[PDB]
Amino acid sequence: PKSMQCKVILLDGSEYTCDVEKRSRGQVLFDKVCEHLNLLEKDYFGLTYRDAENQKNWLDPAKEIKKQVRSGAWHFSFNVKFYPPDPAQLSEDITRYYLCLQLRDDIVSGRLPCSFVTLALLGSYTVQSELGDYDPDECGSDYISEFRFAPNHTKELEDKVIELHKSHRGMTPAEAEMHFLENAKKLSMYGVDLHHAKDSEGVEIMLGVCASGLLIYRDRLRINRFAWPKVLKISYKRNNFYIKIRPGEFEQFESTIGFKLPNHRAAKRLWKVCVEHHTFFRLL
Ligand SMILES: N#Cc1ccc(CNCc2ccc(F)cc2)cc1
């Protein structure tokens, strides 16, 4: 029985390598990675790969791996797929730990914008979880942490992390990670998957996919939001993406809203993530 080597970048930046049968469905690999991570609350997570166009794609666990990666390498990343709106409701601390690792990368990458003070507060909880209580012996007036906290590090940010870290004496790792998540979950771009698009007039917008629905970002002035329960049907056709909205009270007709995506693959990608979010957060 012929087996393919898989490589998976884990959220701590390490590599997990395993072999699966070449006709294996995505679930086979995902189960091996989750067992490696001692992760039981698996439903929030998934594997991504990079396509022939270098776009991030979710590996569909119900479909053959080979039919997805096609001509590319069996190289994947382990990621959060569904960001829980209330991380305190997760059963296990280790689930919150992996969600923290994802969010740290969302911040450093700049996908999750964050004020100076929130960058410092999140960094201070991470340090507290991983190193424990503040130690002046580890940090002089000129201290720079090995921890990546932000898309652009400054000395002022390092100092503020230390100042807040001093205030967390006696905090345990699960406690610190829960505080991290209580702050992170409030950020306006928390768990938002952003997609470049044009409206039915050709104006550049962003479509954001998240627990609370589909967000349209026209710019700092005018942001529309469609809660998932208001959405009856998501479709795509060529480069176009459409949402069918429930009729409003006393309105005779449903309303269909149309967007232009970069190409057909990008319309299909957006359709699939919206459908998956709609289903997940309907049931969660
Ligand atoms: N410079 C340099 C340099 C960078 C990376 C590596 C090893 N990368 C392994 C790896 C590949 C694909 C994958 F998905 C997971 C892990 C070695 C040297």
DSSP summary character for residue 140: -
Q: Which residues pair with 3 in a beta bridge?
A: 21
Q: Which of 7, 18, 56, 65 to mutate to test the pocket of ligand 1 (most atoms within 8 A of CB)?
A: 7
Token pair, residue 192, equals 């938002």
- Cβ atoms 48, 95 nearer than 8 A: no
Distance 77 CA to ligand 1 centre (A): 12
Continuous segment of H or E residues that includes residue 49? strand 45-50
Binding site membership of 218 for ligand 1 (Cβ less than 6 Å) = no
Question: Does residue 214 share a domain with residue 154?
Answer: no
Question: Does residue 50 share a domain with residue 113?
Answer: no
Continuous segment of H or E residues that includes residue 278? helix 264-283
Question: Does residue 179 share a domain with residue 278?
Answer: no
> CB atoms < 10 A from the CB of 244, how many?
14
Distance 33 CA to ligand 1 centre (A): 18
Question: Does residue 74 share a domain with residue 156?
Answer: no
> CB atoms < 10 A from the CB of 11, how many?
20
Helices 93-108, 173-184: crossing angle, 10 deg rounding: 50
**Nearest-atom index, ligand 1, CA of 77:** 14
Question: Does residue 200 share a domain with residue 156?
Answer: no
- Out of 145, 172, 189, a domain closes at 189
Note down the domain range covering 243: 190-284
Question: Does residue 284 share a domain with residue 198?
Answer: yes
- Out of 189, 224, 241, a domain closes at 189
Question: Does residue 86 share a domain with residue 185?
Answer: yes
CA nearest 80: which of 225, 266, 267, 277?
277
**Nearest-atom index, ligand 1, CA of 9:** 15
200-204-208 Cα angle (round to 5):
90
CA nearest 234: which of 185, 284, 168, 282?
282
Domain count for the chain, please give it: 3
Question: Does residue 86 share a domain with residue 65?
Answer: no
Question: Does residue 107 share a domain with residue 74?
Answer: no
- Out of 189, 204, 230, a domain closes at 189
DSSP reduced 3-state for 197: strand
Question: Does residue 64 share a domain with residue 121?
Answer: no
Question: Does residue 70 share a domain with residue 52?
Answer: yes
Question: Does residue 146 share a domain with residue 243?
Answer: no
Residue whose tokens read 């919206």: 274
Q: Which of 9, 36, 47 to mutate to test the pocket of ligand 1 (most atoms within 8 A of CB)?
A: 9
Question: What distance in Å separates the CA atoms of residue 76 and residue 80, rounded to the nearest whole number?
Answer: 13
